[PDB]
């Protein structure tokens, strides 16, 4: 079946019911310092497979973070499809970070599975999802664009219409 | 020419013959059988009667307290009509589980026989069944005429299609 996150550490804090997993990013936010592999690398390595699956059992909190990034990866591809350069893809992945609803608000069409945020849990959730959106968008820009040259690769653009669990952030 | 008076007669006879009711065997414990088939209780058989249109086309009706057996001698003008009739009656008899009232083999010396139990007159309208048997008698005569013309017609075409090529 589908692919789950195997980075579930004994001392991993939460945010809602998502795991607050560290990332190795240059964007500022409420993530811990991150050696090589993290939840965003795990999400991209797994993306092309998971996106076909409709059903998904949630083994632990780390999977809810994995799901979110997977869904967002599809939102990047929708926007990357029209771009004319790896540089322009970065402009709009910055824009796609700055632009979406959270667990509780009109979905985020998964309010059944995710948990709601008080003041402190709410402002941190906004900012952690933002840091995921900004770092995921950045790494995708390297992966999606072909250097011969500056068009998006059809091997990432062919996934643009496929929806993970038939859910979408747009 | 003499079809319509003959059917009107067969109808009224069926109308009297299909006055059935459910009837438990008085011979075998907790059994239920069409008495016209088993014939083991003589007081329960009604007098057999024939209606005949001529020497070749007739109907025999065998009534009983819970079952009726209509058997039909069909018009068969010539050998080709005979074999079409036999092919066709055989075809419908093979399908006799779908006709709930059709008998798998005809009474000896007839082409096709119906066996209508009290269970059929209970779950269908008895006057519609009568309508059906009269309907059936008409239509198998039409259908044999169709099939007879059909064979003649394709015989012509097959003879020409071969000969026009010499």
């Amino acid at each position: 079946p589908a692919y789950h996150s195997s980075l579930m550490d004994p001392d991993t804090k939460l945010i809602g019911n998502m795991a607050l997993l560290p990332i190795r990013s240059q964007f500022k936010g409420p993530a811990p310092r991150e050696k090589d592999t993290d939840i965003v690398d795990e999400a991209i390595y797994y993306f092309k497979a998971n996106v076909f699956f409709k059903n998904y059992e949630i083994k632990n909190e780390a999977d809810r973070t994995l799901i979110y990034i997977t869904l967002y990866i599809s939102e990047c591809l929708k926007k990357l499809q029209k771009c004319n350069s790896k540089s322009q893809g970065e402009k709009e992945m910055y824009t796609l970070g700055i632009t979406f609803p959270i667990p509780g608000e009109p979905g985020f069409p998964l309010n059944a599975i995710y948990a709601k945020p008080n003041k402190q849990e709410d402002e941190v959730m906004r900012a952690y999802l933002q840091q995921l959106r900004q770092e995921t968008g950045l790494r995708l820009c390297e992966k999606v664009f072909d250097p011969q040259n500056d068009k998006p690769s059809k091997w990432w653009t062919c996934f643009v219409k496929r929806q993970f669990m038939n859910k979408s952030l747009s | 020419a003499t079809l319509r008076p003959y059917l009107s007669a067969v109808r009224a006879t069926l109308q009297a013959a299909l006055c059935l009711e459910n009837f438990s065997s008085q011979v075998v414990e907790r059994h239920n059988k069409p008495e016209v088939e088993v014939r083991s209780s003589k007081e329960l058989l009604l007098q057999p009667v024939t209606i005949s249109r001529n020497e070749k086309e007739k109907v025999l009706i065998e009534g009983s307290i819970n079952s009726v057996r209509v058997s039909i001698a069909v018009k068969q003008a010539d050998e080709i009509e005979k074999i079409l009739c036999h092919k066709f009656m055989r075809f419908m008899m093979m399908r006799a589980e779908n006709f709930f009232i059709l008998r798998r083999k005809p009474v000896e010396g007839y082409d096709i026989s119906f066996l209508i139990t009290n269970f059929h007159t209970e779950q269908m309208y008895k006057h519609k069944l009568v309508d059906f048997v009269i309907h059936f008698m008409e239509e198998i005569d039409k259908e044999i005429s169709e099939m007879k013309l059909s064979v003649n017609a394709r015989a012509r075409i097959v003879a020409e299609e071969f000969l026009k090529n010499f």
Partner: protein, 377 residues
């Protein structure tokens, strides 16, 4: 006090238990004891539960042909009958009447008395011969009991209360074998059934639709010349099938054992041959005291067919063909409406009318004092 009695006919197929003075058995369920193969399933399953999950348990019948083969599993089955899920009784404050099947070894007969007093500690126990109960239940002491159940069919001469071991014959054809045969017939009709997997589904088709033909040549003429025998039947999976002449062909195995490769004569010829090997004076008295019992005697037409078949035999091989003397042939094959569980019905009545007596019930006092047995016949 007062109370409290209980009764138990341990069938090969089905356990029928209830209370003295019951008119139907208060519980009927398969005589079954299934262990699981893998990890609300318990370490063991009995009766209804065990039949329900039968595709997941290695299942055992401790009764083979009316006799106990496995005393271990038999204990579990008795724990189930008495235990909460059925009777919920304290065995120690109860009397109990059991039935013993034909030609049971006294080894077994003993061991149960031993089991009942040692392992369950009933205050009162009694053991009745089936054939004698079924006759006592109808105001009879002499006579012939035809018991056809699940495993085997027994023909049991009884004389003034005593069963006769050396005139009691068996036919290794009954309920299971007919269900099994009907599967074969539905197979030849073109339905891909399985003898194991679909035994229960076809058993219910048999119970629901099969009957015994009175005149087989005539039933075959109906089967072959009409569709009046044909019936739809909806299977568990939803599929509908047609059952026709196989309705009477399946139970015909009772009268014609060769139809399922079984040596012997078939119940009517067997019954005739057995009655005929007795005293001239007791022959008369047997022929007018034939009694049916058990589940496989419920097929519509069965008693008529037995009557007819005995007359044909007596005419051909006793009256040597002349029908003028047939009229004198007195013959009674009584088929009570409650004949399916006569052994229980008889035992329930007897355990009731004998409940508050003293010399009847063999006591725990007696067996400890001792010992097995403790029989007073």
């Amino acid at each position: 006090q007062g109370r409290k009695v209980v009764v138990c006919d341990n069938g090969t197929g089905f356990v029928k238990c209830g209370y003295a003075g019951s008119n139907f058995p208060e519980h009927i369920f398969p005589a079954l004891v299934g262990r699981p193969i893998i990890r609300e399933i318990k370490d063991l399953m009995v009766g209804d539960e065990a039949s329900e999950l039968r595709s997941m348990l290695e299942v055992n019948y401790p009764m083979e042909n009316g006799i106990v083969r496995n005393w271990d599993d038999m204990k579990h089955l008795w724990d189930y009958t008495f235990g909460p899920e059925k009777l919920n009784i304290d065995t120690r404050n109860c009397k109990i009447l059991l039935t013993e099947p034909p030609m049971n070894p006294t080894k077994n007969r003993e061991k149960i008395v031993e089991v009942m007093f040692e392992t369950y500690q009933f205050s009162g126990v009694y053991v009745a011969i089936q054939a004698v109960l079924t006759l006592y239940a109808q105001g009879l002491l002499t006579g012939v009991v035809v018991d056809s159940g699940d495993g085997v069919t027994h023909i049991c001469p009884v004389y003034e209360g005593f069963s006769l071991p050396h005139l009691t014959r068996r036919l290794d054809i009954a309920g299971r074998d007919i269900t099994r045969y009907l599967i074969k017939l539905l197979l030849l009709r073109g339905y891909a059934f399985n003898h194991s997997a679909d035994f229960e589904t076809v058993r219910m088709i048999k119970e629901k639709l099969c009957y015994v033909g009175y005149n087989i040549e005539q039933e075959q003429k109906l089967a072959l010349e009409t569709t009046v025998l044909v019936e739809s039947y909806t299977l568990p999976d939803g599929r509908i099938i047609k059952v026709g002449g196989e309705r009477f062909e399946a139970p015909e195995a009772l009268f014609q054992p060769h139809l399922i490769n079984v040596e012997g004569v078939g119940v009517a010829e067997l019954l005739f041959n057995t009655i005929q090997a007795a005293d001239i004076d007791t022959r008369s008295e047997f022929y007018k005291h034939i009694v049916l019992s058990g589940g496989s005697t419920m097929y519509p037409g069965l008693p008529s067919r037995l009557e007819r078949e005995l007359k044909q035999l007596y005419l051909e091989r006793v009256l040597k063909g002349d029908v003028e003397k047939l009229s004198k042939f007195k013959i009674r094959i009584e088929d009570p409406p409650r004949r399916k569980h006569m052994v229980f019905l008889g035992g329930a009545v007897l355990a009731d009318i004998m409940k508050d007596k003293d010399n009847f019930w063999m006591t725990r006092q007696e067996y400890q004092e001792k010992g097995v047995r403790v029989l007073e016949k």
